[PDB]
Amino acid sequence: TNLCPFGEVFNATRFASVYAWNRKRISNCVADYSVLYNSASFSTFKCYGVSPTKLNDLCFTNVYADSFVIRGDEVRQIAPGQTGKIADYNYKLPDDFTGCVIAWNSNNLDSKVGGNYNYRYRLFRKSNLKPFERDISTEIYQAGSKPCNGVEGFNCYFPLQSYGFQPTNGVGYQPYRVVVLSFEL
Amino acid sequence: QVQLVESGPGLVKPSETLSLTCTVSGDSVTSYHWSWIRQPPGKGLEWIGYIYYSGFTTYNPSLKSRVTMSLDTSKNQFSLRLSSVTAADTAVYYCVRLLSGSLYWNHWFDPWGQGTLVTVSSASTKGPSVFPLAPSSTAALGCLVKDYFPEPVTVSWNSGALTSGVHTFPAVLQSSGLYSLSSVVTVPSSSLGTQTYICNVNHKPSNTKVDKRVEPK
Amino acid sequence: EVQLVQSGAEVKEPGSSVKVSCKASGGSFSTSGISWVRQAPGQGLEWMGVIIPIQGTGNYAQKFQGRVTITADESTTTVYMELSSLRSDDTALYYCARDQHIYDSSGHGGLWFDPWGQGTLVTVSSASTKGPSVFPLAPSSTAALGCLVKDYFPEPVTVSWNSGALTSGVHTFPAVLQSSGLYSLSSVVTVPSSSLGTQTYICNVNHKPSNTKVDKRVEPK
Amino acid sequence: AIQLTQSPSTLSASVGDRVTITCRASQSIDNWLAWYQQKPGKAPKLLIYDGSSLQSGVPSRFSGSGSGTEFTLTISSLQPDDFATYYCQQYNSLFLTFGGGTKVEIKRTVAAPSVFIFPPSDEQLKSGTASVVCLLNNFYPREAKVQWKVDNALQSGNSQESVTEQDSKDSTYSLSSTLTLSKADYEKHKVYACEVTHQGLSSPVTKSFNR
Amino acid sequence: AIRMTQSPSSLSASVGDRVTITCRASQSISSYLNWYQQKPGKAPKVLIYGASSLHSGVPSRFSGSGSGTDFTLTISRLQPEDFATYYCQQSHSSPRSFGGGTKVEIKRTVAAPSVFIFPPSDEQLKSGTASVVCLLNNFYPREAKVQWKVDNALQSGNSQESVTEQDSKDSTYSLSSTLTLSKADYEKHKVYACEVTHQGLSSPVTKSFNR
Amino acid sequence: VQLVESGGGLVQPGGSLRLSCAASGFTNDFYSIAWFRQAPGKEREGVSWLSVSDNTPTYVDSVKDRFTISRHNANNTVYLQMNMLKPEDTAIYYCAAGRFAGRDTWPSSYDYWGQGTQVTVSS
Ligand SMILES: *[C@@H]1O[C@H](CO[C@@H]2O[C@@H](C)[C@@H](O)[C@@H](O)[C@@H]2O)[C@@H](O[C@@H]2O[C@H](CO)[C@@H](O[C@@H]3O[C@H](CO)[C@@H](O)[C@H](O)[C@@H]3O)[C@H](O)[C@H]2NC(C)=O)[C@H](O)[C@H]1NC(C)=O
User: Fold this and answer.
1) B73:A108 CB<8 A
2) Which fold has domain B129-214?
3) C-alpha angle with apex D66: D62 to D70, nearest 5 degrees?
4) What is the atom index within ligand 1 of the atom nearest the CA of A9?
C-alpha cells in the first residue's frame, strides 16, 4: 500500500556529515529495490549478505537508511572488515553485515568555489567505534598524559576536522553521498 | 539579509553579447545558489538558469546554447552572459537568490533584485517630433510624441499647473524601432479661446524640450 | 586569509558589563578557535580565553574565570565576549584572533593567532564628555611654545599649528590619566626665537567628542 | 516541459471580498509550487511555497491549498495592497516554469467611455506622414473593442492600441488607438472613422472627420 | 601556569645589524613557541610559529630556533621597518602566556636635551589652578631623570612625565613634565625649578622662574 | 582465491575480441566480477560489472552497446565480449572480484585482482 519514502532519502537536499550520520528508520511500506540497483546514478552499489534482486522478495522487520558525505577515496571503507579514519572513528559496519551500500558522486551539490567546510569527520578517538555507533561529542582529544583543560595545545587536538571540498579537486577528493541500507530481521 | 543589485548595459545592439552582473551585499556569493529571471515588457515571467555555489549551472532548455553563468567570488558577485541577442531578448532581468527545498531540485526565488531593463534595438538617440492634438469638434486635447528613442518621454501641461484629467499612455514600440506615445487631458471646452494650453515635452536623452501651444485650428 | 572585524570603542563605568563582537569573514567557522587577547595601555599582551563555536561554551584563563563569558552566533558568524564587573584595570585594547594549530605527528608545530581584529578600545571611567581647557604655553626667556590641553575626556585630542602650515618641530605627547579621571596632554613646537614678534602662532585644538575647537594665539607675555 | 495555466486570466473583486486563483499543471508536481505577487513596475514578491507554507512577513489573509495538478490561492479579505499580478511557479523538474499570470483589480461600477478623434496636423503633413488618433476616456471594465475604417473600409495591421491602468480617482481605464498612413495614402482618402465597442456602451460609437 | 621570560626588554640596534632575542620558559613547552611583531597603533602579526617555521610573506631575514625551555629569535639584517616590539608566546597549554616583550629601537649617537619651563598663565590662575610645565627636547638615549623643586624644596607625588617615541628624523626622544598646584599653594611660593639629568648632559641643568 | 585473465591481443578498429577471467577459490556464488582498463597515463576505470549471484550485467555509458559480459557456469568463467573496438580502447585490461553482490567503480573496493592483459586497437 504505502510507498517507502526512498525519495526523501536519496534525493534530499542536505546530507549529514559522516561523524553525525543521519539514520532514518523505514517500516510499514513496500519498495522496489530492483529498480534501485539498475539505476544509473549510483556509481557504487554493493550488497552484502543479500543479493540486490532478491530484496523485494524477502520481508524484513525494519530497514535503516544511514546517509552521509565522505571523500571519494574513503568510499572503500564503508564495508565490513575495513580500517581507516572513517571505518574506525566515524562510521563502522558490523562484520556480519546484511544490507547494501550505495554511493554516488555529488561534486555539484556539496562543493564550494572557496571550499565547502560544512562537512566534517572525526579525526581522533580514544577507542574504535562499535558497529552502528554515533559519536557527536566535541570534547578535546587528549593524546598525551597532561589533562587538556578544554583548550587546544600540545598533545591536545580538536577531534573534528572539516573536508575541504572544491569543484577543482581530483576524483578521489570529491564528496560522495553514501546511503547504507541495513536490513534487520 | 541578502540584498541584490543588478548592473549592466541597458542598450545592446542585435547579435551581440548581453553581459549582466548581480552584486550581492550582506553575505558571501558562495553561501547560496543564485538564478536569473527575465520578464519581457507586458508578459509573463521566464526563468533563464541558476548556478550553484559549486559553479555547476543548469540552463533553460530553450536558451541552453546561448546562456553562460559564472561566479566572481573576488567581487562577491555572479554574472550572466547571453549571446546573439535579438528583438525577443529585451526584457527586465532580475537576479534572485535560489532557496532550496526538501529535494535537491526544489527551488523558489527570494529575495529578488530591483531588476534592470535591457533593450535590443538598432537605432541611436533621436529627438521626438511634437505635433499638436488640437481641440476640435468636455474637450480633449494633447500632443503627439512620435519617433523618439530611447524611453522615456515626460510631458507636463502649463508647466505642471494642469494635472487633473491628464493621461500619459505608456509608449509603444513601432516597427521602425522608435517609440511613440500620446498624452491627453480633458478640459472644459468653454474656455478654449481664453485659456492657453502648452504641452511641455521633454526628451532628456536627446535634450529635446518643446513648448507647443495647443490651440484650435 | 580569513578577515576579522570587531565592534567600536566603548566607554563604561565600574561594575558594569561590556559586550564586544568579532565577526569572522568566514572560511572555517564552527571549528576554528576564536581567542580573545587583551593589552593594557603600555603593557604586555594577555590571553583571556578561547571558544570553538561548535563546542558552544568557552574556556578561559585562570585569571578571568567567573567574569568573562564567550559565546558564538553561528548564523551571523560572530563571536561575543562579555566582560562583566569592569574595574579600572580593564581599560585595554581587546583583540579577537583565530587559532591555527598545525601539528605533524608527534607534537611538532603549535598554535598561533594569524588573523587579528583591529582592536576594541574599552575605557572604564567615572566622568562624562568634557571640553578641554586650552591654556597658552607662551614662549618666554630656538624658542619653545605650545598649548596645554587640560581636563578633557575621552581621548583623543588633535592639535595642529597655524592650520597645519607648521609641522616641523611639532611634538604631541601622549595623554596622561590624571587622578581626577580626565586626560591631559601638551603639544609643543620649536620655532626660531627671532621671529616671535612677527610670526603668528595659533594652536588648533580639536576635541571632537565635545566638539570644542579653540584657536589660541600663542604670544609672548 | 511542465506547463502551468492560471484561471481566470483577469479577476475583478472589491475590497473585503474572497478571491480564488487556480493554477493547473500538465503533470503531477506534488506540493512543489510557489506563488509570487507582482505589483506593476516592481519586483515580484514571494508569498507561498511548498503549496501551503506561508512566507515570513506575508499577511495571513493569503492561503495556499492544493496538491497534485490543481492548486488554489485564496485571499480572505481583499485589500488595496492586494491589487497586483500573481504568478504560480512549479519546481518539480530541472526546468522551472512560471504561469501565465492572474491580474486582480479594483472592481467598480460599469462606466462608459468618451470618444475623441484627431485629424493630423498640417505641420506633420508637410513631413509626408499622417497620424490619426482615437481616444477612449474613463471606461470600465477594461475589455473594449476598437475598429478603424478609412472610406468605410475596415483597416487591419495599420493601427496600435495603448491602455492606461485603473485611474486613482474613479478606477476607470483610458485607451488610445493611432492610425498611421503616408501623406500620399492620406491624400488618396477623405473619410477616416474610429469605432468603439464597450460593455458600458449600448451601441458602438463612431467618430469621423473629412480631410 | 607556565611563564615566559624575555631578555632584553629594550635593545638598540642600527640598520643591517644582527639582533638576538631570548625567550625562556619556566618548564618545557616542546616546540609550541611563537613570535609576534607589533607596531604602534596596529594589531600584532606573526613571524615564527612552532619555534622554527616562518609565516607566509615573512622576510627570510627573521629566523627562530630552540626547543624545550630555551628559544631564540634572530634578525640577520635589521631594516628600517623592523623596529617594533617582539613578543614570544607559548602555546603549550592554557594560559598561553606572552613574554614581557622586547622593544627594538634605532641605535644612534648620544644627544643632549634642551630644557624649557613655562609659568602658568593668568587665565588659568583665574580658574584657581596652576600648572608648571618642564620640557625636554631631542635627547638620546631615553633614560633621563627629572626633579621638581619649589622654593628649593624637592617635590614628590605632584608631577607626571610623558615621553614621545623616537623622532623620525634624528631618532631622539622628547619628554615633558608637569607640576600641578592650587592657586593658593601657587601664591604661597615664589621660586619653581625643574632639574634635568641625562647621560648626554655633563651636569644637571635647571630652569626656574619667579611668580 | 585466484583470478586468471586471458584473451587479449592486437586488433584493427571496428573489430571484436573476447576476454576470459576465471575465478577459482570462491566457495559460493556470492561475489561480483568487474573489468578495469588502464589507459597509458590514466588511472584504472571500470567498464563492466557482473553480479554472479544475480547475473545482472552493467555497463558504463561509453560502451553501453559495444561491450557484452556474460558468465559460463560450467567453467565458472566470465567472458567480456568486446565489439566495435576503437583506438580509445587501447589499454591494459584487468578483471577483479569482490565478496559482494553488486558493482563499484573504485578499484580499491576489489580485493582480488588478476594479472592484466594488453589490448591494442589500431590499424
Ligand atoms: C530521485 O530523483 C530521481 C530524479 O527524479 C526525476 O527528475 C527530477 C528532476 C524530477 O523531475 C523528478 O520528479 C523526476 O522523477 C529519480 O529518478 C527518476 O525516476 C523516475 C521513475 O520514478 C524515472 O522515470 C522513468 O523514465 C523512464 C524513461 O526514461 C520510463 O520508462 C519509466 O517508466 C519512468 O517513468 C526517471 O527517468 C528517473 N530519473 C533519472 C535521471 O534517472 C529517482 O527515482 C529518485 N529517487 C528515488 C529513490 O525514487
Assistant:
1) no
2) Immunoglobulin-like (2.60.40)
3) 115
4) 48
